[PDB]
Design a protein around this ligand. Structure first.
Ligand SMILES: OCCOCCOCC(CO)(COCCO)COCCO
Ligand SMILES: OCCOCCOCC(CO)(COCCO)COCCO
Lengths: 11, 96, 96, 11
């Protein structure tokens, strides 16, 4: 699950 | 005579009608776009669109319902993008 | 924030905003479409769109202004389609 | 010019 990280959640 | 069937092709916003297409290089569905930024279909959205993970439907129309900006932090990742790539993950629902 | 930038993808009509793309298999610009029918850009339209015949711009937005249904009657033809193929030729102008 | 023929002119 940690192959990718969220930089900006949905606005 | 398809007045309403007009798709967005970049700068996607909630409510946009979009074309979702199979990207064989990244082994995933993506939004069709003229931008070089990748917009991957969220795995959660596949059942709603009658798509399957991993005959394989080449495209479907949908409406954007959510977008999230993300970064690949491992060189081996679910979208087969280079380490460090920033991209969007999009949830979409089927269209009328 | 591109409310107006929404493209038609089939069943093209006069006035539709369309994405015109290079098709390297047919060595010509075509309308981007989900249909298997080919919509070739008329050679007359290339100057208006700042395109050149034969860096090579991969896509441009335009508006459909005319469409003509045609058939290839020689196996050697300008669009590199099989003998007998029926297709459209489209004239398009640049968009705002 | 005769490699292609018009089946239906613009409507
Ligand atoms: O994904 C490739 C990178 O896309 C960014 C540039 O947009 C190119 C498009 C839209 O993706 C490719 O058409 C093939 C799409 O399935 C339209 O341009 C036509 C070039 O011939
Ligand atoms: O021209 C190829 C035949 O097109 C008819 C089917 O539409 C396929 C599309 C639109 O052309 C191809 O995207 C590549 C376009 O540049 C979208 O489907 C995605 C399949 O992965």
């Amino acid at each position: 699950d940690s192959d990718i990280v969220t930089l900006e959640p949905p606005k | 005579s398809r007045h309403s069937e007009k798709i967005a092709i970049r700068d996607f916003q909630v409510g946009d009608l979009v074309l979702i297409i199979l990207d064989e290089r990244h082994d995933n569905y993506v939004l069709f776009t003229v931008s070089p930024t990748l917009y991957f279909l969220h795995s959660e959205s596949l059942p709603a669109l009658d798509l399957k993970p991993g005959s394989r439907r080449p495209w479907v129309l949908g409406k954007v319902m959510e977008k999230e900006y993300c970064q690949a932090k491992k060189a081996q990742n679910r979208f087969k993008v280079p380490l460090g790539t920033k991209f969007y993950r999009v949830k979409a629902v089927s269209w009328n």
